[PDB]
């Protein structure tokens, strides 16, 4: 097996929304209080796992900025590649991260993601899945 998670990330004026997919099924959701309008600050947060100063929530000047994180648990490493909008063949990842660790399952693979963004995401709301 290879555990894989696809995480759709939306930055908006309300914060950062993570939707976690598993074989194309929405498996889990979480939210973070990460309010960042510019692409530069968003990608800096995505790379570093944190950002020092958040922007103001402005419901009259809203925004929507979307990224996709792809996590793979290869036999002797975990990788995370983050793509603008979604993984496509014409575009390359904005952020590349790698860890010398073995993960058994999607729950461990999510823990790696959550630990890179430590302190930000609330606990998972999880949904019924019908695998394959």
Numbering used by the authors: 10 to 141
Report text from the authors:
Programmed –1 ribosomal frameshifting (PRF) in cardioviruses is activated by the 2A protein, a multi-functional virulence factor that also inhibits cap-dependent translational initiation. Cardioviruses present a highly unusual variation to conventional viral PRF in which the virally encoded 2A protein is required as an essential trans-activator. The PRF-stimulatory activity of 2A is related to its ability to bind to the RNA stimulatory element. Here we show that 2A adopts an RNA-binding fold, allowing specific recognition and stabilisation of the PRF stimulatory element in the viral RNA and direct binding to host ribosomes.
Here we present the crystal structure of 2A from encephalomyocarditis virus (EMCV), revealing a novel RNA-binding fold that we term a “beta-shell”. We crystallised the protein and determined the structure by multiple-wavelength anomalous dispersion (MAD) analysis of a selenomethionyl derivative. The asymmetric unit (ASU) of the P6222 cell contains four copies of 2A related by non-crystallographic symmetry (NCS), and the structure was refined to 2.6 Å resolution. Unexpectedly, the four molecules are arranged as a pair of covalent ‘dimers’ with an intermolecular disulfide bond forming between surface-exposed cysteine residues (C111). This arrangement is likely an artefact of crystallisation, which took >30 days, possibly due to the gradual oxidation of C111 promoting formation of the crystalline lattice. 2A adopts a compact, globular fold of the form β3αβ3αβ. The most striking feature is a curved, seven-stranded anti-parallel beta sheet. The concave face of the beta sheet is supported by tight packing against the two alpha helices: together, this comprises the hydrophobic core of the fold. In contrast, the solvent-exposed convex face and surrounding loops are enriched with arginine, lysine and histidine residues, conferring a strong positive electrostatic surface potential at physiological pH. In addition to the N- and C- termini, the β2-loop-β3 region (residues 28–37) exists in multiple conformations that deviate by up to 5.8 Å in the position of the Cα backbone.
